Amino acid sequence: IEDLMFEMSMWRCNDELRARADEVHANSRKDAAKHYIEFWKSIPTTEPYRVILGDVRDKLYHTRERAHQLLSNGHSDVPVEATFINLEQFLEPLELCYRSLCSCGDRPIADGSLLDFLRQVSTFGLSLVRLDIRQESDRHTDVLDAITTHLDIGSYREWSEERRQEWLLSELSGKRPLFGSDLPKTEEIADVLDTFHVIAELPADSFGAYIISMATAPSDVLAVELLQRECRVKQPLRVVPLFEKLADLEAAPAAVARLFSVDWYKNRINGKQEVMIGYSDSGKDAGRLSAAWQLYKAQEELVKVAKEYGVKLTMFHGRGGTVGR
Amino acid sequence: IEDLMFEMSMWRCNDELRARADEVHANSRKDAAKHYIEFWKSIPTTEPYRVILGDVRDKLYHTRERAHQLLSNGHSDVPVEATFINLEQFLEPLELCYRSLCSCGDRPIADGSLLDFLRQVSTFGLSLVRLDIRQESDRHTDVLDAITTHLDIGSYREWSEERRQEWLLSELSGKRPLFGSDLPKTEEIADVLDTFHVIAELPADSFGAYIISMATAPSDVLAVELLQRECRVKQPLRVVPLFEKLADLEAAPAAVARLFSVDWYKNRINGKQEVMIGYSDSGKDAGRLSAAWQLYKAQEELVKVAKEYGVKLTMFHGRGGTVGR
């Protein structure tokens, strides 16, 4: 950002960027500002891009300081309002500078360092990569089983698929909390629940998708949705099944179609669904040729199902480095 | 405490108090300790009572500092382990000094300032008075009605007494949480729920009894027990009905007997039950003679009921200053 401030030395802007830069220059904080090396004096309105990008620099300095303290120590005194909390609170000022340069005839300048910076923001965001979470279904089933046993309503494990779907749906549409603080948990159970609490405590744009290993039925997906909402995940991330064993790939389209048949899930999914297709274990229990062919068929019929339900399907290919995987 | 330290200048003690004094003198913190005016030097083991009572002074200093910060601000950095948290964590050292003085032939000395201090501790505790909470039954009913409506299971107000009892018992014996963060509350509803949260945040020995105004049935008591358990009141305070109007005194023994009839409640009540008997409003709607006589009859038949259930009844007389109340 400091070099970007150095470049944007123009004086022509719109009425818009003029008004915004004047806004920043009003609350300019006439101070020493000696924590920066360059531009420690209050930036004059003669160069408005430097005003706006100077504010961008302030919020970047405080975002970095907050992330550094949050990482090093378990807490931070930095005010959240002093940082960039939104993915495009960051983008807004830079977008404005772009509109200004283009409007005043300076589009070549805008399509330079400012454009590179824009694409870097809109590609890497506030956390370079969105993190995926993966977990095997049996662990979720263990959790739910502890929940139903502690609630004295039965044992989720012994329950048939139908029962799982009905119960999970009633709990998802219900408004009453499920488990409590006094739930008897195992180290595994506490592991998965604590992962959901960590997901809840952290910003939403730092996460990607929750991938379920050894997924076979809609009950596993609805299980992850229920566990997410119940651990108070403010913005729950999308759930995605992982079909890796040949048996799971042969029957995957049927299962995904049954999942789309649940109207509550099709109405929360918002026309977008992602499903993962593993390549490692497919050619391990069966032949390499048989695995490849079944993978092709699987992709084809998954797209067929998604078209049948009007859902935009994005497929997640778990490809390896070696041809064997 | 500092004057008590000055008096206890004996050098004879038991082996018990000797060993304890050596313990305190081991972790004696050889420091300047200049925050006190007197006894800022590490107290020598020659006067063991001064060692022990000096430690008492440290924990009292940090208990006072903690309470002062908790009140003044809203939190305290004072470690709880540095204070007196128990009603008789305080009592232990003083009881020890007493046993020691008595063993060494100094019972007269022990029955002096040390005995006064003992009685003051065991009478006023860490908070001079135990606080009662009182609230009218209709407000608890409003809360529960909001909870059952928000849970879409009916309306607690419209429910008969029987149904209220069965539901409340099922929730009290159940282990699943009731309402949640998203329960629609009124300013009154939030008032009562927030009082239970305040009770939950504060020490148990700072509270007394929860008195229910206009109490008529076991459901009124069980309602408060449930709200206590559900607002995470770690040590719930005893629930006590208040019969003040002549109609309520006429029917108080029947209601208390009906409450003792619920075995679930009698087995938690631990053989002790308190019920309040107001005196103001009785002689206001009916005669003074009639009210007095009905009060007498009420006390008599309540004792009969409690004796019949093997419950130690302690009656709370809401007497006024004027004979009219």
CSV table of N, CA, C and O in Angstrom, one decimal, chain A residues 252-299:
chain,number,residue,atom,x,y,z
A,252,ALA,N,-23.7,-42.7,-6.1
A,252,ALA,CA,-23.7,-41.3,-5.7
A,252,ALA,C,-24.8,-40.5,-6.3
A,252,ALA,O,-25.5,-39.8,-5.5
A,253,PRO,N,-25.1,-40.6,-7.6
A,253,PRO,CA,-26.3,-39.8,-8.1
A,253,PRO,C,-27.6,-40.0,-7.4
A,253,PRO,O,-28.3,-39.1,-7.2
A,254,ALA,N,-27.9,-41.3,-7.1
A,254,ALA,CA,-29.1,-41.6,-6.4
A,254,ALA,C,-29.2,-40.9,-5.0
A,254,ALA,O,-30.2,-40.3,-4.6
A,255,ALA,N,-28.0,-40.9,-4.3
A,255,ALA,CA,-28.0,-40.2,-3.0
A,255,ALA,C,-28.1,-38.7,-3.1
A,255,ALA,O,-28.9,-38.1,-2.3
A,256,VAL,N,-27.4,-38.1,-4.1
A,256,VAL,CA,-27.5,-36.7,-4.2
A,256,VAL,C,-28.9,-36.3,-4.7
A,256,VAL,O,-29.5,-35.2,-4.2
A,257,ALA,N,-29.6,-37.1,-5.5
A,257,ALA,CA,-31.0,-36.8,-5.9
A,257,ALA,C,-31.9,-36.9,-4.7
A,257,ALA,O,-32.8,-36.0,-4.5
A,258,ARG,N,-31.7,-37.9,-3.8
A,258,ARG,CA,-32.5,-37.9,-2.6
A,258,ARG,C,-32.2,-36.7,-1.7
A,258,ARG,O,-33.2,-36.2,-1.0
A,259,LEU,N,-31.0,-36.2,-1.7
A,259,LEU,CA,-30.7,-35.0,-0.9
A,259,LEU,C,-31.4,-33.8,-1.4
A,259,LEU,O,-32.0,-33.0,-0.7
A,260,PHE,N,-31.4,-33.6,-2.8
A,260,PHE,CA,-32.2,-32.5,-3.4
A,260,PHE,C,-33.7,-32.7,-3.2
A,260,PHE,O,-34.4,-31.7,-3.3
A,261,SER,N,-34.1,-33.9,-3.0
A,261,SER,CA,-35.6,-34.2,-2.8
A,261,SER,C,-36.1,-33.5,-1.5
A,261,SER,O,-37.3,-33.2,-1.4
A,262,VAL,N,-35.2,-33.3,-0.5
A,262,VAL,CA,-35.6,-32.7,0.8
A,262,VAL,C,-35.8,-31.2,0.5
A,262,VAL,O,-34.8,-30.5,0.2
A,263,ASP,N,-37.0,-30.7,0.6
A,263,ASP,CA,-37.3,-29.4,0.2
A,263,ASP,C,-36.7,-28.3,1.0
A,263,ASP,O,-36.3,-27.3,0.6
A,264,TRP,N,-36.5,-28.6,2.3
A,264,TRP,CA,-35.9,-27.7,3.2
A,264,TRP,C,-34.4,-27.4,2.8
A,264,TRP,O,-33.9,-26.3,2.8
A,265,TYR,N,-33.7,-28.5,2.4
A,265,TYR,CA,-32.3,-28.4,2.0
A,265,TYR,C,-32.2,-27.7,0.6
A,265,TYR,O,-31.3,-26.9,0.4
A,266,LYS,N,-33.1,-28.0,-0.3
A,266,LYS,CA,-33.1,-27.4,-1.6
A,266,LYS,C,-33.4,-25.9,-1.5
A,266,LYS,O,-33.0,-25.1,-2.3
A,267,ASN,N,-34.2,-25.5,-0.5
A,267,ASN,CA,-34.5,-24.1,-0.2
A,267,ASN,C,-33.5,-23.4,0.5
A,267,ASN,O,-33.4,-22.2,0.5
A,268,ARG,N,-32.6,-24.1,1.3
A,268,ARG,CA,-31.5,-23.4,1.9
A,268,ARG,C,-30.3,-23.3,1.0
A,268,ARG,O,-29.5,-22.4,1.1
A,269,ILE,N,-30.2,-24.3,0.1
A,269,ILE,CA,-28.9,-24.4,-0.7
A,269,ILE,C,-28.8,-23.3,-1.7
A,269,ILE,O,-27.7,-23.0,-2.2
A,270,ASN,N,-29.9,-22.6,-2.1
A,270,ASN,CA,-29.9,-21.4,-2.9
A,270,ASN,C,-29.3,-21.7,-4.3
A,270,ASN,O,-28.5,-21.0,-4.9
A,271,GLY,N,-29.8,-22.9,-4.9
A,271,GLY,CA,-29.5,-23.2,-6.3
A,271,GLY,C,-28.0,-23.6,-6.5
A,271,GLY,O,-27.7,-23.8,-7.7
A,272,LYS,N,-27.2,-23.7,-5.5
A,272,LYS,CA,-25.8,-24.0,-5.7
A,272,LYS,C,-25.4,-25.2,-4.8
A,272,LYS,O,-25.7,-25.2,-3.6
A,273,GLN,N,-24.7,-26.1,-5.4
A,273,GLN,CA,-24.3,-27.3,-4.7
A,273,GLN,C,-23.0,-27.8,-5.2
A,273,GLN,O,-22.7,-27.8,-6.4
A,274,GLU,N,-22.1,-28.2,-4.3
A,274,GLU,CA,-20.8,-28.7,-4.6
A,274,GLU,C,-20.7,-30.1,-4.0
A,274,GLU,O,-21.1,-30.4,-2.9
A,275,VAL,N,-20.1,-31.0,-4.8
A,275,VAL,CA,-19.9,-32.4,-4.4
A,275,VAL,C,-18.5,-32.9,-4.9
A,275,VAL,O,-18.0,-32.5,-6.0
A,276,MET,N,-17.8,-33.6,-4.0
A,276,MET,CA,-16.4,-34.0,-4.2
A,276,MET,C,-16.4,-35.4,-4.7
A,276,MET,O,-17.2,-36.3,-4.4
A,277,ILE,N,-15.5,-35.7,-5.6
A,277,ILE,CA,-15.3,-37.0,-6.3
A,277,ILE,C,-13.9,-37.4,-6.1
A,277,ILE,O,-13.0,-36.9,-6.8
A,278,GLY,N,-13.6,-38.3,-5.2
A,278,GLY,CA,-12.3,-38.8,-5.0
A,278,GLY,C,-11.7,-39.7,-6.1
A,278,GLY,O,-12.5,-40.5,-6.7
A,279,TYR,N,-10.4,-39.7,-6.2
A,279,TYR,CA,-9.7,-40.6,-7.2
A,279,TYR,C,-8.8,-41.6,-6.6
A,279,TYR,O,-8.4,-42.5,-7.3
A,280,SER,N,-8.4,-41.4,-5.4
A,280,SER,CA,-7.3,-42.3,-4.8
A,280,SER,C,-7.8,-43.7,-4.6
A,280,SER,O,-7.3,-44.7,-5.1
A,281,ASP,N,-8.9,-43.8,-3.7
A,281,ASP,CA,-9.3,-45.2,-3.3
A,281,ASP,C,-10.2,-45.9,-4.4
A,281,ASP,O,-10.4,-47.1,-4.3
A,282,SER,N,-10.6,-45.2,-5.4
A,282,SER,CA,-11.4,-45.8,-6.4
A,282,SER,C,-10.7,-46.9,-7.2
A,282,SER,O,-11.1,-48.0,-7.3
A,283,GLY,N,-9.5,-46.5,-7.7
A,283,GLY,CA,-8.6,-47.5,-8.4
A,283,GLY,C,-7.8,-48.4,-7.5
A,283,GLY,O,-6.9,-49.1,-7.9
A,284,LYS,N,-8.1,-48.4,-6.2
A,284,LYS,CA,-7.4,-49.2,-5.2
A,284,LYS,C,-8.2,-50.5,-4.9
A,284,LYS,O,-7.6,-51.6,-4.9
A,285,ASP,N,-9.5,-50.4,-4.7
A,285,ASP,CA,-10.3,-51.6,-4.4
A,285,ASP,C,-10.7,-52.3,-5.7
A,285,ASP,O,-10.9,-53.5,-5.7
A,286,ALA,N,-10.9,-51.5,-6.8
A,286,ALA,CA,-11.2,-52.1,-8.1
A,286,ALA,C,-10.1,-51.7,-9.0
A,286,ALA,O,-9.1,-51.1,-8.7
A,287,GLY,N,-10.3,-52.1,-10.3
A,287,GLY,CA,-9.3,-51.8,-11.3
A,287,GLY,C,-9.1,-50.3,-11.6
A,287,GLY,O,-10.0,-49.5,-11.2
A,288,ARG,N,-8.0,-50.0,-12.2
A,288,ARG,CA,-7.8,-48.6,-12.6
A,288,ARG,C,-8.8,-48.2,-13.7
A,288,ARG,O,-9.4,-47.1,-13.7
A,289,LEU,N,-9.0,-49.1,-14.7
A,289,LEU,CA,-9.9,-48.8,-15.8
A,289,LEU,C,-11.3,-48.7,-15.3
A,289,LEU,O,-12.1,-47.8,-15.6
A,290,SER,N,-11.8,-49.7,-14.4
A,290,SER,CA,-13.1,-49.7,-13.9
A,290,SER,C,-13.3,-48.4,-13.1
A,290,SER,O,-14.4,-47.8,-13.2
A,291,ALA,N,-12.3,-48.0,-12.3
A,291,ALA,CA,-12.5,-46.8,-11.5
A,291,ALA,C,-12.6,-45.5,-12.4
A,291,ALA,O,-13.5,-44.7,-12.2
A,292,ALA,N,-11.8,-45.4,-13.5
A,292,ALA,CA,-11.9,-44.3,-14.4
A,292,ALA,C,-13.3,-44.2,-15.0
A,292,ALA,O,-13.9,-43.2,-15.0
A,293,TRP,N,-13.7,-45.4,-15.6
A,293,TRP,CA,-15.0,-45.4,-16.3
A,293,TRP,C,-16.2,-45.0,-15.3
A,293,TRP,O,-17.0,-44.2,-15.6
A,294,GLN,N,-16.1,-45.6,-14.1
A,294,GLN,CA,-17.2,-45.3,-13.1
A,294,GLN,C,-17.1,-43.8,-12.7
A,294,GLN,O,-18.2,-43.2,-12.4
A,295,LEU,N,-16.0,-43.2,-12.7
A,295,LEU,CA,-15.8,-41.8,-12.4
A,295,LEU,C,-16.5,-41.0,-13.4
A,295,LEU,O,-17.3,-40.1,-13.1
A,296,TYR,N,-16.3,-41.3,-14.7
A,296,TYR,CA,-17.0,-40.6,-15.8
A,296,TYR,C,-18.5,-40.7,-15.7
A,296,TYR,O,-19.2,-39.7,-15.7
A,297,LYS,N,-19.0,-42.0,-15.6
A,297,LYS,CA,-20.4,-42.1,-15.4
A,297,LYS,C,-21.0,-41.3,-14.2
A,297,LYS,O,-22.0,-40.7,-14.3
A,298,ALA,N,-20.2,-41.3,-13.1
A,298,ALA,CA,-20.7,-40.6,-11.9
A,298,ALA,C,-20.8,-39.1,-12.2
A,298,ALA,O,-21.9,-38.6,-12.0
A,299,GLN,N,-19.8,-38.5,-12.8
A,299,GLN,CA,-19.9,-37.1,-13.1
A,299,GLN,C,-21.1,-36.8,-14.0
A,299,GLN,O,-21.9,-35.9,-13.8
